[PDB]
Amino acid sequence: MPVFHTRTIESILEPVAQQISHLVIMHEEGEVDGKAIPDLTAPVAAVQAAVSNLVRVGKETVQTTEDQILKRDMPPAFIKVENACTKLVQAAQMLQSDPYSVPARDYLIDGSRGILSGTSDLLLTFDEAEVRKIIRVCKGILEYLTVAEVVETMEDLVTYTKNLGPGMTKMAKMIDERQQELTHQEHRVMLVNSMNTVKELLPVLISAMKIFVTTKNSKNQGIEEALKNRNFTVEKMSAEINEIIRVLQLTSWDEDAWASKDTEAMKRALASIDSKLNQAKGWLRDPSASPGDAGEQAIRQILDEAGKVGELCAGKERREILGTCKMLGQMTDQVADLRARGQGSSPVAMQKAQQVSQGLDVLTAKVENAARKLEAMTNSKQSIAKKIDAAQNWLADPNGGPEGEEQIRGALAEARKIAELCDDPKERDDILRSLGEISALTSKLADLRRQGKGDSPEARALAKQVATALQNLQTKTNRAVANSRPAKAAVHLEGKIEQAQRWIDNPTVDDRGVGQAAIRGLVAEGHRLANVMMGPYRQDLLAKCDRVDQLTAQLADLAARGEGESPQARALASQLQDSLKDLKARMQEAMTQEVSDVFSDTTTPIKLLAVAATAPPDAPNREEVFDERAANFENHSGKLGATAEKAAAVGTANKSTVEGIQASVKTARELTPQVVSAARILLRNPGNQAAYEHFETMKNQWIDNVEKMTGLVDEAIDTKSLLDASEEAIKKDLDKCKVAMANIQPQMLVAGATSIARRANRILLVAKREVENSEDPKFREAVKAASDELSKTISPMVMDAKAVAGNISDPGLQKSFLDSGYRILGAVAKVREAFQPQPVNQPILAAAQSLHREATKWSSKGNDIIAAAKRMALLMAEMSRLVRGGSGTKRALIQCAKDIAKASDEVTRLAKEVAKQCTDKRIRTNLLQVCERIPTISTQLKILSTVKATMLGRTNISDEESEQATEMLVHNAQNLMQSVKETVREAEAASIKI
Numbered sequence: 001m002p003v004f005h006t007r008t009i010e011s012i013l014e015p016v017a018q019q020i021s022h023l024v025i026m027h028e029e030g031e032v033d034g035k036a037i038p039d040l041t042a043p044v045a046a047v048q049a050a051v052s053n054l055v056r057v058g059k060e061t062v063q064t065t066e067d068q069i070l071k072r073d074m075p076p077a078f079i080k081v082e083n084a085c086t087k088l089v090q091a092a093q094m095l096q097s098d099p100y101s102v103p104a105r106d107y108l109i110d111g112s113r114g115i116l117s118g119t120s121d122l123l124l125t126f127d128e129a130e131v132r133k134i135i136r137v138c139k140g141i142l143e144y145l146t147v148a149e150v151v152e153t154m155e156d157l158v159t160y161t162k163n164l165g166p167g168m169t170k171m172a173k174m175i176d177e178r179q180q181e182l183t184h185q186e187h188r189v190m191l192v193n194s195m196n197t198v199k200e201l202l203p204v205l206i207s208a209m210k211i212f213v214t215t216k217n218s219k220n221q222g223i224e225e226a227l228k229n230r231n232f233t234v235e236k237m238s239a240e241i242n243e244i245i246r247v248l249q250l251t252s253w254d255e256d257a258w259a260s261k262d263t264e265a266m267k268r269a270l271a272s273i274d275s276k277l278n279q280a281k282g283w284l285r286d287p288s289a290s291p292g293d294a295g296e297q298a299i300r301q302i303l304d305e306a307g308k309v310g311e312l313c314a315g316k317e318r319r320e321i322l323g324t325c326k327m328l329g330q331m332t333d334q335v336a337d338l339r340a341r342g343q344g345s346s347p348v349a350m351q352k353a354q355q356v357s358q359g360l361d362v363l364t365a366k367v368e369n370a371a372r373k374l375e376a377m378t379n380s381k382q383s384i385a386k387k388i389d390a391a392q393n394w395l396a397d398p399n400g401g402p403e404g405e406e407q408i409r410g411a412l413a414e415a416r417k418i419a420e421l422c423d424d425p426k427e428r429d430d431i432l433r434s435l436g437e438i439s440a441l442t443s444k445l446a447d448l449r450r451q452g453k454g455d456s457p458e459a460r461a462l463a464k465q466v467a468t469a470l471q472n473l474q475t476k477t478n479r480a481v482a483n484s485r486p487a488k489a490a491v492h493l494e495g496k497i498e499q500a501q502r503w504i505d506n507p508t509v510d511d512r513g514v515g516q517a518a519i520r521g522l523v524a525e526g527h528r529l530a531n532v533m534m535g536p537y538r539q540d541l542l543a544k545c546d547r548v549d550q551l552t553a554q555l556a557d558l559a560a561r562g563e564g565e566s567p568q569a570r571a572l573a574s575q576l577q578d579s580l581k582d583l584k585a586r587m588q589e590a591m592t593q594e595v596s597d598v599f600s601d602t603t604t605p606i607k608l609l610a611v612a613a614t615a616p617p618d619a620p621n622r623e624e625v626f627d628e629r630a631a632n633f634e635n636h637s638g639k640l641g642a643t644a645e646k647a648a649a650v651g652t653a654n655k656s657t658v659e660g661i662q663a664s665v666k667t668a669r670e671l672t673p674q675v676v677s678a679a680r681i682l683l684r685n686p687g688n689q690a691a692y693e694h695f696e697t698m699k700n701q702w703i704d705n706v707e708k709m710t711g712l713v714d715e716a717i718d719t720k721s722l723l724d725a726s727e728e729a730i731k732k733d734l735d736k737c738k739v740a741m742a743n744i745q746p747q748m749l750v751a752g753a754t755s756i757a758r759r760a761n762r763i764l765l766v767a768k769r770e771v772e773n774s775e776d777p778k779f780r781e782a783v784k785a786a787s788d789e790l791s792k793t794i795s796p797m798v799m800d801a802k803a804v805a806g807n808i809s810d811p812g813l814q815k816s817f818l819d820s821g822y823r824i825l826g827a828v829a830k831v832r833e834a835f836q837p838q839p840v841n842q843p844i845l846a847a848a849q850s851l852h853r854e855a856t857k858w859s860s861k862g863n864d865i866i867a868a869a870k871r872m873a874l875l876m877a878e879m880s881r882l883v884r885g886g887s888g889t890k891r892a893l894i895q896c897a898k899d900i901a902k903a904s905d906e907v908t909r910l911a912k913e914v915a916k917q918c919t920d921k922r923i924r925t926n927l928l929q930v931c932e933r934i935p936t937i938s939t940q941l942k943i944l945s946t947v948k949a950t951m952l953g954r955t956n957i958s959d960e961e962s963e964q965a966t967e968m969l970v971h972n973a974q975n976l977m978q979s980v981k982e983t984v985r986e987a988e989a990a991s992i993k994i
Helices: 007-024 028-032 041-063 068-097 102-125 127-150 154-163 165-181 185-217 224-248 263-275 277-285 295-309 322-341 352-378 381-394 402-421 428-449 456-477 493-501 514-522 536-550 567-581 588-598 604-614 624-650 655-684 689-716 719-742 746-773 781-805 813-833 842-855 865-874 890-916 921-931 933-950 961-989
Strands: none
Touching: 007 041, 007 102, 007 165, 007 890, 007 933, 028 102, 028 890, 041 068, 041 102, 068 102, 102 127, 102 933, 127 154, 127 165, 127 185, 127 224, 154 165, 154 185, 165 185, 185 224, 185 655, 185 689, 185 921, 224 655, 263 277, 263 295, 263 352, 277 295, 277 352, 295 322, 295 352, 322 352, 322 536, 381 402, 381 456, 402 428, 402 456, 428 456, 456 961, 493 514, 493 567, 536 567, 588 624, 588 719, 604 624, 604 655, 604 689, 624 655, 624 689, 655 689, 655 921, 689 746, 719 746, 719 813, 746 781, 746 813, 746 921, 781 813, 842 865, 842 961, 865 890, 865 961, 890 921, 890 933, 890 961, 921 933, 921 961, 933 961
């Protein structure tokens, strides 16, 4: 396959394929029009010269570079290119004899593919080696990690504190080489953002090591908690290093990410169901304890996370978790109806207090059914990706060995077993296709039964066809999960609109199940948004949530009775589509009300934990205060993480901002135990001088983590939305200042004056971060200036608070406080005041009209990015028939190779054109990250469409590899035009910002 693993490989193949394109448009009169050609016999030797240079180094790389497996695979590679090139000249030599010789036109069309596959192989095959030594570098590091528990003593500390140096500095220089070598934002970003984690936390690993000798100064057998905290980061060192091992091994377009990035969600979920197990079910079992806000909230946290389990599995099980959870919702409100009146809850729910419980416990077992199957479904994809390589191993160099046949037939016994474990009852057409191919693969395995004496002359034709048989397996085993795993929720919210706007009125991806998960996805968050409010404000959102819930199944049926053209089917679709638009501004405005109420006192228990970190047992209650401060820490943090990830998945952010949140909240998910772990050991070995800075380390980790996140959640939501949900929020809190002055409450003003300064400091912090991202000097000055007005008045509120706490029954004095309070909030309001101003492949024809709905968001004709998007998706419509068919006109397919890249290099330009006029860093940076994959994938379509041109109309065309050709055609145009959707949107989204 014509890979694009390296910047160099693109920089050569497009020079390779530029004239093989021009070679085979001569083949258009060569066999389609069937007539004589002009003498392009010199471009023959030119592209020979364009490959012989890498051949003449590739020939000697077999011998000069002393690696073993390069000697194995290269003589398959370039000799095929040599077998191609020798046929090219003789095609022209037979065309020197004859103006148009029927074999000679077929000899040249024979070689025109084998170069392009071969050159893409040759440029890959030793770039495969360039990655390979970096593995053993990392394997050197990963096993020098393994040294660092064999090493636990100080006499090897400063040695290996130095020995990391020529490893770790030698790590990053190879990576920062390779960081320039890839050409995907999806790859370049996830490489280095795992590479900084190992270099940042190796001093933290050293910080564990430097404090372990301090514990080793204390007596043994109570000190391995540090080595377990070492093992904490070392398993993270096991984690983030292993990630970038296999990132560089990917060497193509990304496919197995989503099957892998859903493994994390269930173990996020199933732990969270285990963690929210006890406190949820108690309110279910206590009628007369809480009226529906404390453990009732954790009840719905169980259900809306198990609802996120059911966003993964397939079939009718996509309904049976939805059907179990939604019917559990009303019956809790049937329980909530009882204690709203009171008499029904304790005596009368002798039956009712168990039908709710049985719809949780078997629901726990029902989502447990989706647990181990979906681990094992993504699993053994990699095993059958590995047992083919074990089959690829010996079948390259057989040497006529009949006991190498015996181990290559024993290795296929495991390669047998996987597809029966990969069997599903759904794709019965493909299952008999799969299971029928397996015994056929044992029959070409049974070719080796006749070789009592092994035959490489049999094996050279055996490996000629078992290699095409294994890629007939792997391109079908990955389908055996792809048509069995439903289409995922686009994690940013505007995708879940788009994954469900067009979904409801079309049978196409009704076979796929995009919106059926996505609508189940989208109101599993407004369902969780309504979880955090009290009694009466739980229902007003749930009434909009239950609106879609009863708009759910009554559009699951109208695919039978008519379609979207049917009148009340369209009306129920129109009732559903109108239901979601007023489920926007009561979802994200529901969100931003929460974030200005969770992140207020953003770190106040931690300075209280710092009080708990310093107080000896000479100070009173060094344990139970230290418990409840940590209990205040651990449970406010549960709000802190969960408020962020909701504001992640609802807030309009970059993908890099969303995963930037998603990793940082994951960083919060274990550092919050580490803050507990840091405050622990300082109180285990009491009052160490060397443990305070380690506590101060993880604190100023977590403070830097949270004051990243505090700033980074502010990257997600609107700053119009934060202030308005803060100015009104501080307004009642200055009205809370009015209630505690009417009675004699000094400390409630002392708790309140902080509560201003908990937030009024942060309002200044958001204003400065707005300025440094702003560049209009008239429209960044007041955000600096009024923040400094806020700076002018934050400190006198602390001072007169001490003046009025000493005398609470002093009108005038407490009046002067609230009058000093009166000066605050109008200036706080100023912050948002500045913010006021036929043989057709289907995924071709779908992706054309898919792009058109996105560019029709803007409704004018001025800037030609919509004319760029016009020519974009329209000029794939002609090649809809030309993939899978249209055997003659190969020339239009390459005419489509160029014009699409010509469009997706034009909109490359205009994306970064207005980015040069983009008046915000964060808007330009997010525009820059996506726009570098506009030209990269464009030129790849110059290759791949030209590759299928040789795969077109020969009539010796294998419809496995023509399918492999047309898969890479259509998989491109998805990833092509989905990036173009992000382009023509965010160009307009940056257009108003000027």
